[PDB]
Design a protein around this ligand. Structure first.
Ligand SMILES: C[C@@H](Sc1nnnn1C1CCCC1)C(=O)NCc1ccco1
Ligand SMILES: C[C@@H](Sc1nnnn1C1CCCC1)C(=O)NCc1ccco1
Lengths: 70, 70
């Protein structure tokens, strides 16, 4: 029953995919909403948004990702 | 070659999983960092953080998720 076990695997895998897909873009649209607050207040009123833009472009990786936070 | 095709499937599935897993928690820790700015400024200095907390608890779902943003 080689493939039979793999049938279970694609199922548990795809379901993890589906729940992860939803979350990825669920919060992804959220960062934009926080960035939209930034576009409103950056330089205009509140500098706090500047350091939250830093969040949306904070890349904790091995390689240093080039970004421009302004 | 039934299982052979499934071997490919678990691979492409798991890889999507792995890249999605990293992103889920990658940004997940980020929302906390934005929330930490909130804990600093909420009621103290900047009300902007209040409406960004609204983001971290904004649940675009069918069912209405009960939350307390303060
Ligand atoms: C967090 C995103 S920022 C980003 N990337 N595409 N769109 N956006 C927007 C979403 C939030 C604000 C801009 C980022 O730098 N990823 C790092 C990365 C991974 C691969 C290439 O680079
Ligand atoms: C966005 C999170 S808020 C959340 N949930 N667990 N920890 N956190 C923290 C991360 C950001 C600030 C608090 C949320 O309501 N999900 C909706 C949900 C899905 C299932 C149950 O409920």
């Amino acid at each position: 029953d080689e493939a039979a076990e793999l049938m279970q695997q694609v199922k548990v895998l795809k379901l993890t995919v589906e729940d992860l897909e939803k979350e990825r873009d669920f919060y992804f649209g959220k960062l934009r909403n926080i960035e939209l607050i930034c576009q409103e207040n950056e330089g205009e009123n509140d500098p706090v948004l500047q350091r939250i833009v830093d969040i949306l472009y904070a890349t904790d990786e091995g390689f240093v990702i080039p970004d421009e936070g302004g």
